[PDB]
Every structure is written in C-alpha cells, then in structure tokens.
Amino acid sequence: EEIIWESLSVDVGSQGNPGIVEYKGVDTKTGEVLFEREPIPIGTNNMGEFLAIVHGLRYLKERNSRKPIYSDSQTAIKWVKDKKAKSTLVRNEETALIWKLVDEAEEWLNTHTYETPILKWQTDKWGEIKADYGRK
RNA sequence: ACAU
DNA sequence: CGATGT
Ligand SMILES: [K+]
Ligand SMILES: [K+]
Ligand SMILES: [K+]
Ligand SMILES: [Mg+2]
Ligand SMILES: [Mg+2]
Prior knowledge:
The protein is α/β, with parallel strands linked by helices.
C-alpha cells in the first residue's frame, strides 16, 4: 500500500477544540499550498476536516482535475460519503458561521457530482499528512 | 477500540 | 491532560 503522490492533501488546524478553525489543501508531492481558509472563530476539528474535503472537491472540479483527495479524518471522510456532517456542536450566535459553512457544504454535495476518490491518509505508516499544521 |  | 467523532 503506497502513497498516491498525484493527489491533493487537506487538513484542519485549530486553536482549541472547539476553537478557532482553519484548513488548507496542499499538493501531496511538493507541499505547495493550493488553498487556505480564513480562520473561523469557533468550530470543531471534524467540521473543519469536513469543510476541507468539500473545498478540495470544489477546487478539483473547477480545475477539471481527476486527482484523489487524502484526508486523515475517518469522521470527515464518512460525513462526505453520507453528504451529512453529524456534528454535536451547539448552534448559537457564536457558532453561526461554522454551521452556515457546513450547511452550505452539504448543500453543494447534494447539488453536484464528482468521481474524486477520497482516501484515508495512513498516518500510522506514512507520518503526518502533508497539509498538517505542525501544532501537535 | 479506531480516527482526529 | 482535554475535546470531536464512528
Ligand atoms: K498539527
Ligand atoms: K493525525
Ligand atoms: K473518545
Ligand atoms: Mg487532520
Ligand atoms: Mg493535522
């Protein structure tokens, strides 16, 4: 089982969980940063991992790329497959933004098609995903 | 247990 | 040590 180097890797970063959430996508081979989301003041790790995958799908579709996406998040991979982010985060004024983005990401999934493989990055074999924030 |  | 999730 080998790394598919012609791929996009994504990952969340946070200050607290729940806390300030951001995410980014990088070229797995080179580490080049292809997109970075502006920090969101309150979210969860899994909401961020979900948004990162969906952004990756939208990024690749816009560019007519068939590359797969790596994610280290078992949860977010499942949520994307299901087209449903099963977060426990309370909905209130301070979580409104992240929930708006999660709702809109789900909506995008429900109105678009893709063949992009969404693959588990095997951290136990390969070390940290290339999109990692180096904060742990 | 597993993944974050 | 704590949290988010299956
Ligand atoms: K990190
Ligand atoms: K990890
Ligand atoms: K647990
Ligand atoms: Mg991750
Ligand atoms: Mg990481």
